[PDB]
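Sanity check. The docking grid for R5T depends on where the pocket ends up, so I'm generating a full predicted complex first rather than guessing from homology. Inputs follow.
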Amino acid sequence: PKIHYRKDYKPSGFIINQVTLNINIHDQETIVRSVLDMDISKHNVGEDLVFDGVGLKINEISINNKKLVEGEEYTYDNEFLTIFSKFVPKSKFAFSSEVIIHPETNYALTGLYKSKNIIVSQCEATGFRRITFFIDRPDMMAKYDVTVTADKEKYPVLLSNGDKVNEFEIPGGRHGARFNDPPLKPCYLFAVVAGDLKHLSATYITKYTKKKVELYVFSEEKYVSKLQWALECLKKSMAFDEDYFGLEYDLSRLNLVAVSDFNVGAMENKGLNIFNANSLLASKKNSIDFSYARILTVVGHEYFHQYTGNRVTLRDWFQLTLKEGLTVHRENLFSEEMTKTVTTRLSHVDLLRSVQFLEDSSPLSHPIRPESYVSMENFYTTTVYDKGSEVMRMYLTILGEEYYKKGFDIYIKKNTATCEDFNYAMEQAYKMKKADNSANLNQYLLWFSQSGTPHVSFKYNYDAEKKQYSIHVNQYTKPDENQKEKKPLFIPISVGLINPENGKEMISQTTLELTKESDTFVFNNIAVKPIPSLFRGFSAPVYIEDQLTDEERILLLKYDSDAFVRYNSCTNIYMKQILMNYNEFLKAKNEKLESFQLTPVNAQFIDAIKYLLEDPHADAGFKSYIVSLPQDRYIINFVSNLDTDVLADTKEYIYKQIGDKLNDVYYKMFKSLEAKADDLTYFNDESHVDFDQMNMRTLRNTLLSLLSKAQYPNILNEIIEHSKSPYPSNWLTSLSVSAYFDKYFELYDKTYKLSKDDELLLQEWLKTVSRSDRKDIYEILKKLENEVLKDSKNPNDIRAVYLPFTNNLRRFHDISGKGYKLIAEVITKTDKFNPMVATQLCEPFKLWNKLDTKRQELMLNEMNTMLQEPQISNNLKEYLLRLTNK
Ligand SMILES: CC(C)(C)OC(=O)N[C@H](C(=O)NO)c1ccc(-n2cccn2)cc1
Ligand SMILES: [Zn+2]
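Predicted complex below; grid placement will be based on this.
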């Protein structure tokens, strides 16, 4: 079970200059012929020629057109092909092979596989070795010449990288196409697509060189009308990279292709981007609102890969966060600019602090550049991606737009790349910014190597006579398995000072640079005692301990200029309340109290929520955040041995407290919001997307949920009327909130009928049901399995049925262990054909050692059971071994 170590990087003792591919697709098999024009590198030392090759059936292999003999000249064990050096040339030579593979039965969705009636490849990170023999690593750059052949009736559209240079008919109702792609590339950027594809197209003229770029977006014929928004998003992405970064698209054509079966959101390949259908396809009638932001970010994401994917080659997979973190950052900038809503940034923060923080304090914790790996398929984490992006984002916060853009330019021009190369580039901008060639970003590198979430805490002092304000800051990171001693990080703290009398900014834009374990920042000429507005925009990926009173937090919530600090101040008020009530419920349970008291929710806090809700000029998206308690996975980072039942009771009490005061306000707003929220003026305009309007629907649907849970008088009338809405976000909401009423299975049937004839819509429906707050939710899942899901191997179907259920605090964590047992059964069943998705379904277990003693034991027993499965994949095993600290 080999472990790859970052310190042991060494260049290959070979070179592959040219790849010449012949991929012949047949009904029961695919024949791949490959000729590799190879050479010997300056690092060679007489070693064996070892190719990666997984699951390949050899017809023959050769060197210089002379067939090799097994046992004497080469061995193959279904993973590595070893050709003994004595039979390996010492100058330029040709290696060739013919193998048979079977996309029809490739249910792991890696390498070459069939999705519905489309043949498609997925080669990142190590899928190309599943197609043909290769030195399957990201620093092996080569030229590609690829011919594809297939039955013309079944596969009329043939696509691969580069230019289609030839099309030819073949005897037997077959045809062929040849694609030459001269620029060098890594093999994980190789792609091939074949199918009965329909497309929308457009021409984009670039800003500077005025070159015409053809844009194609493909799907199966049935869903071709759902492709327009994706096309628009692509236009948007090209324009943004132009305007913000000055980068034009390098090529003359861009293809986006949607497939039904895909392990992740999408995959960039040079000129040919392949997508999960749920991240490319949408219509107003058959998609929930969330799809539109999702497609925008994913299309944008794969697009921003393009310019840097050229010019910059990863030395090795340990530099993944440099590729992925930078792109997520660019994607985030794009999305914030395109949506123009503050909830876009908030939603990314909400994601980081729930999911990634949980990961970073779990046994799976790793830095964004890990020191080792067993399975590359487990390397693609929220830590590598989302903490990666926040570390990439901090460079911008530190430098500002002008110098950031200068540093980014340096990085591209100057540059195989490492995270250090990016740092060095940004460092040069840093020097120029501070006009001090002695200035450096050496400490910043700790963001790449140090695991765990730093804690930043504050103390304050105001001297009224001196007009002098001080902010005392402390940072620390808890030791973990990756570092016994944690060093202080370079932490940029974006701050303002709010005058509590009139809500005005008291100082200009200021970013404190914390570089020590602690420091004191002093401000003179501060006329009155301020309320500090800290980590504006969430300027560092840290736990913030603001040490503010709730009165101060309320004042920030009402009057601060920064959306994140307002939202965080709200969050912190909620957390103080949750921790207090949790401990009160816990003591009552422990001590078997017959009676006890609960601390009520702060009344001025409830007044502040009402104030903001009733402000017609305030933002609807932001409003939906303030009436929602913090995520369970955020809360859990703050509680030891969490009793999920006691947390459930805590949330219930707090929601009830606030509703008992504000429900009439909620109902009034739910009604007055209807006209603008559900405005149908542009319903049939496929390209008109209004993110403010979708936020209004989010607010209405949030309020509807609060009112339904509270059994507000006659709310069922509003629920039934809601189900008749043309918007899936609304009529799917009507389903889940109807859970608290007798009419649930009525709406269950109605919404099923609406959903069943669209594959993606059906999956949203499954999700809605899966997350329904039903006491009979286990019986309901069983129904979904037997009637809808069955033995589907579509990752979308499986994740749709089970993942939302796992977020059901009271039910998934049922003390019998029944929920853990159920998901472990699904994981083990899935792992037989798709280990990557099996690992995805482990996600609820990631917090196992944070729970109360009994639930820890239950989760651990189920993981140990999974670990005991004789046929467990290497993927699942490694992951569960790390998670259970074994
Ligand atoms: C959601 C998004 C767009 C941020 O990421 C993806 O949809 N896919 C990423 C990616 O970087 N696409 O360019 C992704 C995630 C995992 C993998 N992967 C995981 C194992 C092997 N490959 C590949 C790509
Ligand atoms: Zn990416």
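Relevant for the grid: The CA atoms of residues 674 and 873 lie 51 Å apart.
Also worth noting: The chain has 26 helices and 29 strands.
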